[PDB]
Amino acid sequence: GDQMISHRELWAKIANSINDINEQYLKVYEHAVSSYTQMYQDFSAVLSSLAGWISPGGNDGNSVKLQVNSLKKALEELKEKYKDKPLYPANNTVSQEQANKWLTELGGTIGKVSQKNGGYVVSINMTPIDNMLKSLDNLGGNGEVVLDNAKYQAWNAGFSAEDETMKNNLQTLVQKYSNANSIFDNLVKVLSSTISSCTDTDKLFLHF
């Protein structure tokens, strides 16, 4: 907030401030947001398929026929595709201590701390998908099961629940990203006044 250093150092620190945010805030969140988005976008593709996976067989209530295997197969391909996909860092490693930090800063439910090797990373939490598969596994024989209305709805409730858990974390990401912009903005705002005070402060010193 003053060091009575050249305007050269001030304009330099300012420029540096933009680089910091861009890499630690924007990029950091543009990845987590993109990563999660891509995944949920793959899950939404499953939902579209889910519609053609349900049919009647009452007779009738209407008892619902569900292609358990078909849904299980799709669901286990999604978790696979994003099983180890990381949210942070985008393309590097970190200390399990700093990895646990980031996770506790954007919630904790959204991602899961893990180690690849060379360090640690905060990967996507595949719990929602797991609970989904556990629910389907509990359904019964494969790869086609028929459940009365009460049973179907009860299941759909659980299923739908999981969906929203991801739908939520998805929106949250957008938050943690906008927050990064805030902190970065707060930075440049005071950094600027700093440079100027140095300038006016500097001028008095120059003036002295």
Residue numbers in the entry: 125 to 332
Q: Could you give the paper's own sentences about this structure?
A:
As wild-type TCs can exist as either homo- or heteropentamers and in order to obtain a map of the functionally relevant heteromeric tip, we used the TC map from the ΔipaB strain to remove images that contained IpaD homopentameric tips from the wild-type data set. Therefore, the one from the data set showing the lower cross-correlation should comprise primarily heteropentameric TCs. However, the highest subunit within the wild-type map is morphologically distinct from the others and from the equivalent one in the ΔipaB map (left, thin arrows). We therefore docked the cryoEM map of the needle with the lowest MxiH at the needle tip, from protofilament P1, lying right below this subunit. After subtraction of the needle density, four IpaD subunits can be docked into positions β to ε of the TC, showing that the volume occupied by the subunit in position α is larger (thin arrows). However, the subunits are much further apart in the new model, allowing for the presence of both a cavity and a perpetual pore within the TC.
T3SSs consist of a ‘needle complex’ composed of a basal body commencing in the bacterial cytoplasm and spanning both prokaryotic membranes, into which a hollow extracellular needle is embedded that serves as secretion channel. The tip complex (TC; Mueller et al., 2005; 2008) tops the distal end of the needle. In Shigella, it is composed of two proteins, each essential to host cell sensing: IpaD and IpaB.
